[PDB]
Amino acid sequence: APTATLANGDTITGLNAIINEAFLGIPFAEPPVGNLRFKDPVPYSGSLDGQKFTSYGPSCMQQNPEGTYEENLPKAALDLVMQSKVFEAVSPSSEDCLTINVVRPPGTKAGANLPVMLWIFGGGFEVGGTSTFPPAQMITKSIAMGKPIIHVSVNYRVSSWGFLAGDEIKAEGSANAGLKDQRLGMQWVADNIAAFGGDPTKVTIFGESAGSMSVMCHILWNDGDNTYKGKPLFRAGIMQSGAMVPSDAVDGIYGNEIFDLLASNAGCGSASDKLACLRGVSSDTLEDATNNTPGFLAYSSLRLSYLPRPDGVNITDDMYALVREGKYANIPVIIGDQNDEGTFFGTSSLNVTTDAQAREYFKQSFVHASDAEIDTLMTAYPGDITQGSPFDTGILNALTPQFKRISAVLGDLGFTLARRYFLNHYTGGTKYSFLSKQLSGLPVLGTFHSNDIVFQDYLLGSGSLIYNNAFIAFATDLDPNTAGLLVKWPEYTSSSQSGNNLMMINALGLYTGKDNFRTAGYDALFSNPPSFFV
Numbered sequence: 001a002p003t004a005t006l007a008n009g010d011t012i013t014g015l016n017a018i019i020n021e022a023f024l025g026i027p028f029a030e031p032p033v034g035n036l037r038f039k040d041p042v043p044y045s046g047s048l049d050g051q052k053f054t055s056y057g058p059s060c061m062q063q064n065p066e067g068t069y070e071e072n073l074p075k076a077a078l079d080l081v082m083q084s085k086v087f088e089a090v091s092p093s094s095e096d097c098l099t100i101n102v103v104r105p106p107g108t109k110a111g112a113n114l115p116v117m118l119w120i121f122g123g124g125f126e127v128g129g130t131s132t133f134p135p136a137q138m139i140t141k142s143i144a145m146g147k148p149i150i151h152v153s154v155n156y157r158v159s160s161w162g163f164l165a166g167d168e169i170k171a172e173g174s175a176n177a178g179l180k181d182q183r184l185g186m187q188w189v190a191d192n193i194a195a196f197g198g199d200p201t202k203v204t205i206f207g208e209s210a211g212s213m214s215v216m217c218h219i220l221w222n223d224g225d226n227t228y229k230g231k232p233l234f235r236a237g238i239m240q241s242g243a244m245v246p247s248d249a250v251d252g253i254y255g256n257e258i259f260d261l262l263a264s265n266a267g268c269g270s271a272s273d274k275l276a277c278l279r280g281v282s283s284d285t286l287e288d289a290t291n292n293t294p295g296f297l298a299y300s301s302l303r304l305s306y307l308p309r310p311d312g313v314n315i316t317d318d319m320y321a322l323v324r325e326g327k328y329a330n331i332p333v334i335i336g337d338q339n340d341e342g343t344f345f346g347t348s349s350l351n352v353t354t355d356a357q358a359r360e361y362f363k364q365s366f367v368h369a370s371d372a373e374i375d376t377l378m379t380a381y382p383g384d385i386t387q388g389s390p391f392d393t394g395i396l397n398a399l400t401p402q403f404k405r406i407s408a409v410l411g412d413l414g415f416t417l418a419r420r421y422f423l424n425h426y427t428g429g430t431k432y433s434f435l436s437k438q439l440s441g442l443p444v445l446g447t448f449h450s451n452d453i454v455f456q457d458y459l460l461g462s463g464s465l466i467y468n469n470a471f472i473a474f475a476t477d478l479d480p481n482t483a484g485l486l487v488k489w490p491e492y493t494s495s496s497q498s499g500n501n502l503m504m505i506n507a508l509g510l511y512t513g514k515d516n517f518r519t520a521g522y523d524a525l526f527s528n529p530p531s532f533f534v
């Protein structure tokens, strides 16, 4: 059976899956339960000696994506599904969920010094777990390429459990617990990966959506100091859909509103110390209270109840400002997007049909935007249905007169144009960028968010050439071009550069293009980034 002797002398046993060897469910932190709730993770102090790690542990508690303080069918329906004994069995979750998984090529031994790809899952900082991201496809392809890599994934707390904010959390120093879970896992990798055959100096961090934004936060963490015991925790990063988070401070307006609401929901509205009151309620009570705060699919949509927020200590300031000021780790990166990131999320506001309703929804969502800014946004992202997302689909997909428009805004501010802003200011290392149009023609959604996960972990498609091959070559040589693709991937310097600067994907394969689309929207959005923060 696969075996590894940890840093502390413990010898653990893994699972031989023939095509790979896996050590699943290794605890890396003490269970963040009871009075440890919402607090920084504590290193796991214990003996794993003689233990087997052959199964993924439970995921952290999950929030109902349709959750909200209102009562409705979608909410009721998902809750029915999520509280079912069958669901509970196929997808177990718990507050004791801080585990890490290591999967490697068969026959890998300590000292192999293989590059390490550390995965951070997406899920709108509200749902997610490591078990739904099979590494077999990545690993198998890495062996066939003669560029074997070791795959590592870490669970982290999501929703209220991991991203609670407000005055109290700030005062306590407990901001961004979920990001701190990810950081500890990185330290565990630095300390223990050599035992599994990986090289701690060849770690590439990567993630999708919420995970991609997590990677960005890790680049910006501690003002760019990514070292642990005198050595950097990662040498590169891959960002699949997501750059800086456009959020106000942890003690800002919305961070405080959500905290108070959750507190009222849990029955802590009258406590003098709501935080200690929240630590005392049962898991069921807390879970209920959380499902009564907006989930990412509810009307509020991407104005998330829980997400990374600057705290003045680990994330010292507005993330857009950190990027302009050079406060980041200096590493080579790959950051890309799916053509139609906002369509799925745009389905959350299908009761908005007129321009007057659109303007009001935008006003409600962006509390810091002036009417002039709102008017500018609505000029840059017009009612014209041929102009919205799914992009380039003409009069098709008109679920409502505003859907394609709202989808265009959501995708651009949340991901696509945010990426361009990062790329235009980042001088930390070499940059590579891609844009996928692999699913052009798919009704309603187009090349929507997360489809890349399918072509990276489940099915093979033209996109796999990038999601697997190119990514593996980057993690190995810090240049995606060593993958030996037919289309050379050009370095990205700025969006105003002459010549193609984007690697592109369609159903047939790869080709290059330019990152010069929707320049009007970019200015509308980023002339003053803080006007559109949540």
Ligand SMILES: *[C@@H]1O[C@H](CO)[C@@H](O[C@@H]2O[C@H](CO)[C@@H](O)[C@H](O)[C@H]2NC(C)=O)[C@H](O)[C@H]1NC(C)=O
Pocket: 070, 299, 300, 351, 352, 353, 357
């Ligand atoms: C679309 O539906 C949403 C969600 O139900 C409406 O917003 C809610 O409206 C009720 C009644 O006014 C309020 O008590 C809730 O607080 C609202 N929820 C949120 C998250 O804001 C919204 O008004 C509808 N939009 C349109 C244009 O009809």
Ligand SMILES: *[C@@H]1O[C@H](CO)[C@@H](O)[C@H](O)[C@H]1NC(C)=O
Pocket: 180, 183, 222, 313, 314
């Ligand atoms: C957060 O910031 C403080 C102040 O610089 C630092 O001591 C602490 O170690 C940081 N936490 C992490 C996980 O890096």
Ligand SMILES: [Ca+2]
Pocket: 166, 167, 256, 259, 260
């Ligand atoms: Ca308060």
Ligand SMILES: [Ca+2]
Pocket: 224, 325, 326, 327, 328
């Ligand atoms: Ca710097």
